[PDB]
Amino acid sequence: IKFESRKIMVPPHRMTPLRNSWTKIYPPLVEHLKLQVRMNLKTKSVELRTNPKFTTDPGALQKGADFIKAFTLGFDLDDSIALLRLDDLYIETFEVKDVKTLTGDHLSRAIGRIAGKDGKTKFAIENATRTRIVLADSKIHILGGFTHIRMARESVVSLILGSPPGKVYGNLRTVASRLKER
Amino acid sequence: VVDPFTRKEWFDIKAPSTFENRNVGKTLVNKSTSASDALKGRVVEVCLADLQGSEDHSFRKIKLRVDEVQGKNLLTNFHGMDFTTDKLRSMVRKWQTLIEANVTVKTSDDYVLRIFAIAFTRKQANQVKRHSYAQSSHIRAIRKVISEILTKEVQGSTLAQLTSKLIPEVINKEIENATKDIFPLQNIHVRKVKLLKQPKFDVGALMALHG
Amino acid sequence: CDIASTPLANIARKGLLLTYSKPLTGQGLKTVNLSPTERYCYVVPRFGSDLKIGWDLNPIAVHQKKQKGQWTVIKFITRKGFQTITGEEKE
Amino acid sequence: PEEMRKRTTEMRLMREL
Amino acid sequence: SQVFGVARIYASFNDTFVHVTDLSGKETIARVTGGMKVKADRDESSPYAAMLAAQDVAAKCKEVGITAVHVKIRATGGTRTKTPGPGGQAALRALARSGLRIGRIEDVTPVPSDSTRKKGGRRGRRL
RNA sequence: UGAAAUUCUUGGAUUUAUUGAAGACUAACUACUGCGAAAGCAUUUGCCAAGGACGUUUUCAUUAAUCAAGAACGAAAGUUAGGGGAUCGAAGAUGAUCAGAUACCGUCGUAGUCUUAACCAUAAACUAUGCCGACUAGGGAUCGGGUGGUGUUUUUUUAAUGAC
Ligand SMILES: [Mg+2]
Ligand SMILES: [Mg+2]
Ligand SMILES: [Mg+2]
Ligand SMILES: [Mg+2]
Ligand SMILES: [Mg+2]
């Protein structure tokens, strides 16, 4: 366990939530991972370094870095804490534009279609696929297990391409049933 | 039937004296049957933080080309500059105007190069408007001032002197001071430096540069 | 004995049975924003603790404060008080 | 005084809101 | 006493590349891909492929003499996605666990200022 | 790929790096905010002419509104004759034809996509909403101009401008 460092730049729009949640962020990093934590106000970036004397798990530093990065992308804190707890969680990212070139009102409606009324359509996908989805404007991030995220990506892509929410919701129930079977 | 690394040999790179830390690691090459031909023209990109030993330069990278070889020491020269992608994505934000200038100019050593500078408008202390867009006239005036400053700095200096100016970011201070009255600005930086053409090689200029 | 919706929410407020939905929107129901950390709005209280049976109660006017970045209900408000508040903001 | 800065902040919050 | 390398990770949709070369980048130390570490093509993009790939390259690097690597993750980029996928992340985690020192992590995905038309067409792609 | 198979590949594919060539397009900043009669319009700099609004104790004095006939332009696609031919790609060919959330997937790709000189004049060419004129509520945000303040910052000599 050698002396190493990591830096993750928090965007302006997320740091106040970092201020909002940081009381619950440094404890797990410092006690469990034995990680020495700091963030530079001047650069507005979190600085993580491995302390050779106390830190023991070689993957601790990278685990913490992804944990903040999970928080940075917009995921809620407890959703990100799962990353620290587990080892097989990854984040999938892509734009709507790769799926389809949508602009103006077409783009806005596509984002609305994914979220659904009161976020129900997004709440549909998250539970069935056992993942979390962040709809950051035209930017989509999915957190979960590798196999899990791929089902989630498919349903989201189907909505972007124009599949109405109802047929997507029906398919979610089908795959949701198969998840319980296995 | 042959493990290639049996026939490889290690070489140690050295940096310009303009940088504080001359040691920038090592590379390797097939042994001469020559090695020098493979070494010449090789480029290595390294963050300014490593060479200057300060994290303040963490978002800046310098490309150095191997120009000479002596006794397992690879003598390099400045070849290019750039910022890290993360830093650039950080600077670009919503609700502000992005002003970018590019200038093609040659140094006193006949080093033709291209400088790209970037800057952003900022809101003042007592601002209550959400955004700080600048009128096209202000953008054009700022761009003219930046281009003139860059051309003056490059023409009236040598390439080594040019890098000596880049490291302390004096040019950014001069730009912001000049463009201050036109419109308040933030994140004024020399985004990129490209080396378009190279003069005839002079090993003397490289040795004197390397002491 | 029987209990009305609004009293039930008040009694459950100091317990762990009561959860608040996001502020409602529409005619009549509008989020009066006193300050960056203060607002008056209608919410739909949910009574009960997705494996148990909970249900939503009648909407109620509540005073919400942003404490530690989360909106916390300080007090309940009568319809007249909320209506007076809306006018007090307009004037 | 520095209280003026606070007035700028809250107005900013209102406008963006 | 600490000799540096560069760990180039190319995370595509259907496979992951772990490519370690000298600082210049010209001479490759060890290249391993998810295809060589897995029996079926479907699991080449699987993270399990990546961790096997990462461990092997790390083992080779220790033998050569490389002890630290600068990570330059990238995706297919161009007209396609600009963010590395889970395969790249899993390989990066393995490199840290492998014991090689990770100097600096940077994204160098090819990002076009303005690009040509994508393969999908007007109706889209990736059903 | 749901798995394969046409495909490339020990003559070194994929990947790495130093370059060079060709043709498109102007990301992020980007916002129903701005301009234009509409269709439309986004890298830097120069030239040519054009335009709204604002300010005017300047100028002519009904010169105006609407508009059959008639005229200019008119997205995308399309035709004639040259040029160019990178990406994408109707048509065509070809691999596979097993499995229903992933059930239409892959490779090669003619015409086209670009441009020059003319044709064609159609779109959900949408605010599914003719044009001009008057009047009939409060409220704060924005774009351009103008007026005012003994308001902040700046000019780090003042200041005057610029930005608030
Ligand atoms: Mg504009
Ligand atoms: Mg032709
Ligand atoms: Mg005509
Ligand atoms: Mg239209
Ligand atoms: Mg009218």
PDB file of N, CA, C and O in Angstrom, chain D:
ATOM      1  N   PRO D   1     -20.558  47.551   3.617  1.00  0.00           N
ATOM      2  CA  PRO D   1     -20.458  46.345   4.449  1.00  0.00           C
ATOM      3  C   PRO D   1     -20.556  45.061   3.631  1.00  0.00           C
ATOM      4  O   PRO D   1     -20.859  45.118   2.440  1.00  0.00           O
ATOM      5  N   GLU D   2     -20.303  43.916   4.266  1.00  0.00           N
ATOM      6  CA  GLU D   2     -20.425  42.629   3.597  1.00  0.00           C
ATOM      7  C   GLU D   2     -21.865  42.136   3.536  1.00  0.00           C
ATOM      8  O   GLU D   2     -22.162  41.235   2.746  1.00  0.00           O
ATOM      9  N   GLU D   3     -22.765  42.720   4.328  1.00  0.00           N
ATOM     10  CA  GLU D   3     -24.176  42.368   4.231  1.00  0.00           C
ATOM     11  C   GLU D   3     -24.711  42.625   2.830  1.00  0.00           C
ATOM     12  O   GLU D   3     -25.669  41.974   2.399  1.00  0.00           O
ATOM     13  N   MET D   4     -24.102  43.569   2.110  1.00  0.00           N
ATOM     14  CA  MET D   4     -24.510  43.831   0.736  1.00  0.00           C
ATOM     15  C   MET D   4     -24.345  42.584  -0.121  1.00  0.00           C
ATOM     16  O   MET D   4     -25.183  42.297  -0.983  1.00  0.00           O
ATOM     17  N   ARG D   5     -23.269  41.828   0.106  1.00  0.00           N
ATOM     18  CA  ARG D   5     -23.067  40.593  -0.644  1.00  0.00           C
ATOM     19  C   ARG D   5     -24.225  39.630  -0.423  1.00  0.00           C
ATOM     20  O   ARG D   5     -24.704  38.999  -1.372  1.00  0.00           O
ATOM     21  N   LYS D   6     -24.702  39.518   0.819  1.00  0.00           N
ATOM     22  CA  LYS D   6     -25.842  38.648   1.092  1.00  0.00           C
ATOM     23  C   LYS D   6     -27.058  39.063   0.277  1.00  0.00           C
ATOM     24  O   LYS D   6     -27.783  38.212  -0.250  1.00  0.00           O
ATOM     25  N   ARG D   7     -27.298  40.370   0.159  1.00  0.00           N
ATOM     26  CA  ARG D   7     -28.430  40.834  -0.635  1.00  0.00           C
ATOM     27  C   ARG D   7     -28.282  40.411  -2.089  1.00  0.00           C
ATOM     28  O   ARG D   7     -29.261  40.027  -2.737  1.00  0.00           O
ATOM     29  N   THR D   8     -27.061  40.476  -2.621  1.00  0.00           N
ATOM     30  CA  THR D   8     -26.834  40.010  -3.983  1.00  0.00           C
ATOM     31  C   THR D   8     -27.157  38.529  -4.113  1.00  0.00           C
ATOM     32  O   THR D   8     -27.770  38.101  -5.097  1.00  0.00           O
ATOM     33  N   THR D   9     -26.756  37.730  -3.124  1.00  0.00           N
ATOM     34  CA  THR D   9     -26.969  36.291  -3.216  1.00  0.00           C
ATOM     35  C   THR D   9     -28.452  35.954  -3.251  1.00  0.00           C
ATOM     36  O   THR D   9     -28.898  35.168  -4.096  1.00  0.00           O
ATOM     37  N   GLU D  10     -29.237  36.539  -2.348  1.00  0.00           N
ATOM     38  CA  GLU D  10     -30.642  36.163  -2.262  1.00  0.00           C
ATOM     39  C   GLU D  10     -31.404  36.632  -3.494  1.00  0.00           C
ATOM     40  O   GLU D  10     -32.279  35.923  -4.002  1.00  0.00           O
ATOM     41  N   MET D  11     -31.074  37.821  -4.004  1.00  0.00           N
ATOM     42  CA  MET D  11     -31.676  38.254  -5.259  1.00  0.00           C
ATOM     43  C   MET D  11     -31.319  37.297  -6.386  1.00  0.00           C
ATOM     44  O   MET D  11     -32.172  36.951  -7.211  1.00  0.00           O
ATOM     45  N   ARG D  12     -30.063  36.850  -6.431  1.00  0.00           N
ATOM     46  CA  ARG D  12     -29.665  35.872  -7.437  1.00  0.00           C
ATOM     47  C   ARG D  12     -30.518  34.618  -7.327  1.00  0.00           C
ATOM     48  O   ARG D  12     -30.990  34.079  -8.334  1.00  0.00           O
ATOM     49  N   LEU D  13     -30.737  34.149  -6.101  1.00  0.00           N
ATOM     50  CA  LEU D  13     -31.546  32.955  -5.905  1.00  0.00           C
ATOM     51  C   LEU D  13     -32.973  33.179  -6.391  1.00  0.00           C
ATOM     52  O   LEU D  13     -33.563  32.300  -7.027  1.00  0.00           O
ATOM     53  N   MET D  14     -33.542  34.353  -6.107  1.00  0.00           N
ATOM     54  CA  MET D  14     -34.882  34.657  -6.600  1.00  0.00           C
ATOM     55  C   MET D  14     -34.934  34.624  -8.121  1.00  0.00           C
ATOM     56  O   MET D  14     -35.799  33.960  -8.704  1.00  0.00           O
ATOM     57  N   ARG D  15     -34.010  35.325  -8.782  1.00  0.00           N
ATOM     58  CA  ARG D  15     -34.073  35.434 -10.236  1.00  0.00           C
ATOM     59  C   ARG D  15     -33.971  34.069 -10.897  1.00  0.00           C
ATOM     60  O   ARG D  15     -34.799  33.717 -11.744  1.00  0.00           O
ATOM     61  N   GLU D  16     -32.971  33.277 -10.512  1.00  0.00           N
ATOM     62  CA  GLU D  16     -32.824  31.957 -11.109  1.00  0.00           C
ATOM     63  C   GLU D  16     -34.020  31.074 -10.780  1.00  0.00           C
ATOM     64  O   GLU D  16     -34.460  30.278 -11.617  1.00  0.00           O
ATOM     65  N   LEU D  17     -34.567  31.204  -9.571  1.00  0.00           N
ATOM     66  CA  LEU D  17     -35.768  30.453  -9.232  1.00  0.00           C
ATOM     67  C   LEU D  17     -36.905  30.807 -10.178  1.00  0.00           C
ATOM     68  O   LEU D  17     -37.618  29.927 -10.670  1.00  0.00           O
TER      69      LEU D  17
END
